[model samples]
Target chain A: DFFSWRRTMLLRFQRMETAEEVYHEIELQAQQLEYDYYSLCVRHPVPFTRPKVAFYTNYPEAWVSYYQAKNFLAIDPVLNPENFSQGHLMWNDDLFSEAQPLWEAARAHGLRRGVTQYLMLPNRALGFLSFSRCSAREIPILSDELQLKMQLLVRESLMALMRLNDEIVMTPEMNFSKREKEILRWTAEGKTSAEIAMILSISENTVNFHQKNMQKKINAPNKTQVACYAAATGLILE
Target chain B: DFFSWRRTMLLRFQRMETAEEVYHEIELQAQQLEYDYYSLCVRHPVPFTRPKVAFYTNYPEAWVSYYQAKNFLAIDPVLNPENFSQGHLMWNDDLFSEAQPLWEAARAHGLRRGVTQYLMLPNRALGFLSFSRCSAREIPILSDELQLKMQLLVRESLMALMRLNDEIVMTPEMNFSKREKEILRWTAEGKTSAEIAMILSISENTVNFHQKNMQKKINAPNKTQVACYAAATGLILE
Candidate 1:
């Protein structure tokens, strides 16, 4: 029965032209799902101390500010779904006990009950979709069907935004020649240059040559960075 | 109304002890989804020269043999969703043109119209759920609701299988001391031991010490492997 609605929404997302239009489309989608508020965060596909948010939805301005000002993502109760691989997380007081103030502040802004779902993309970026309802008495329990739909919607939203912004980086085309990749693979396996030279039956200088070129291509400064970059970029498989 | 059905199935999966029981549960679940055949594949957390399938359903033994004998994963058209990060991929002629023989073999074995969904988990493993049916005239186009439910069901199924078989490896408890992690992060950023020492106000020996220690902990043989292992294991988040 809702297939047409989903199809239309998906088609609109595909045809979206601008970031402003994307925001509006998401707002309308959130409304359709009966979620009073929604937030979608997209991170880059690199290794870093803190992954930056490439795209975020139009959540409450004050809530965003408060979160940033207090650095709530560090203490976010549902942000990191540690045990569960990927699924919807229902918000509750116990979950936010470590960050009681964050939860209280959110509730004060009419964001009482909510559910958040996480999607780990192939690009190594993390995407999240959070839905919230303002009414304290009305806790919205998203059906399995709705959560799944939202998962796809959120993924499409991020993909469209990333595409429009040219945020999809690190394609397989970013070449590390066969020899260079082999060197990097050994490097990721915790092999030293000397050891790799012996294993590949090449001189130490040849190994270093490949390592240096690999570093240049990956824009890494050192061997460690080369391995990390190669692994993170899917250049070096685990 | 099917919430109870989903709940009961999930509970059964959690309590399942043998592969036979898991298969039985899936057979019953597939009946609900009106799918005659299903294949669930679980991949490991690390990047490999090629991804490995940990567990797969016995949809068509002959097709599996053919795929393995021909090394079809390299050209398995639908296996890799190149552009979009993650979602359900509908199988069609265009997707399997290059692998026509594999597709033909599958079709001959009562596998016709199908949908494959990909899910990337937090532990870094990849899980896929594929549903197919024999009827060509009665192509089953899953509704938005059914698709969403199947997504979760497949995820749970893989998780349970992994847990039962002890396939999910690399727990967070595998320790890398703060110093070792710091060293690995710097190493991944292209910093050599000497450079990292200068930056951290530690001696070059200390940096090398931590690097070697980090390598040992991640079971890597060298500095490069240490960095790669750290990044791949989510120790160094990019």
Candidate 2:
């Protein structure tokens, strides 16, 4: 149901590229359900790309101050893989040491935080959905369910964005024969041809042959270069 | 040093149980080493018991024929939470739908089979170890480092096998208050009447008042009951 709305929103938003439009859709949907905040996360598979976050709240001064206080965008762990692990649903309290004090000060005034994670297609962490509240009474368990719906809607929004970007991360030629892929994967994993041969029960000569062919076909000069290129080009996983 | 040793014996053995006298020492050493698979994870606050896995290198032809033919435990999640969480160092192949085929064909050659996870700290899933061997000479990559180290050090596994009857489970008894202990000691000392009251800086009436409360709180009906509660519950920590 939410996906359908997201599809419609995606069509509408494609012609209109305004952050306020996207934020307005969230506020409009959330007001019907009486939510205080709406946040969307867009996790990219590429290591260097920052996770795109779209957050809005009814509380304008509070929201503005929250982002402005520490300039958190410079050191946000949810966006930084070095600080936070992927595939975790963390509360505000679960953040690493740096954010705790400021987060606590914010919570004291009237801010509740919740997070949701998504493993998007083709082995990328697509995004997250987060919410905030003034008091415990205003926020209840059912709001969490509503938040999930909004998150799905935002994910469809991202898919639409991807289509507009015309970035084809996955393609037909990227797919290799299962054995060929396995050999390629191990080679990328820093396994020597002899080691791959032993694990695969193929002769070392065969392992080298496959690796040489993989490098040539991929147009990579060396093993290290090929592995990085394969990962970068989505020939292998990011 | 252990990493150097593991690098030396990569892909060489399956089960490596540690000895008794050095069990705790090994766990402590592993803690110092920052090896993720060394298990000493008993200190972690995770709920639910982690299961002990049985990994097999080379099962007999008969067992492989019976088991692999049936595909009985092929998709067990316990063996394959790695598929969800990723970076599974020592996890079993049979646990995941994707990795099972690698083991299935390997089993046909009588290569690897059997119970792999022997967690330390009784059922606590404490210290776990795994090692490996292949029919062909192979150096498994550094990614396999965790599984290989655990396999070689069975001395660590001894901690997992030890029964929880040992007093390690009751470490929280140290939180008893000074007043609570004083109440117990007064009961033990047989100090009755105004003497105990004056000693404790309360009215004589309050003396019996606190005594009665303490007895009930400790689940003891009388002074004798109070003494027995202290002595029998291992609250002394000795």
Best by TM-score: 1
lDDT of 1 by residue, B49-137 (tens): 34446655768788778777987766766566562223667787888877888788778878878777777655666667777877776
TM-score of each: 0.78, 0.32
Q: Over 4 Å off in model 2, which ranges?
A: A1-32, A35-38, A44-74, A77-97, A100-126, A132-182, A186-221, A228-238, B1-67, B70-238
Query: Candidate 1's fnat?
Result: 0.65
Tens-digit lDDT string for candidate 2 (A77-192): 55443332223354556573677655765566566654444434332334544455555564444433454455445555454444444233222234455666667556544467
TM-score of candidate 2 versus the correct structure, residues matched by position: 0.32
Candidate 1 DockQ category? medium
Q: What is the lDDT of residue A123 in candidate 1?
A: 63
| Fraction of real interface contacts that model 2 preserves | 0.00
Docking class of 2: incorrect
Top lDDT hit: 1
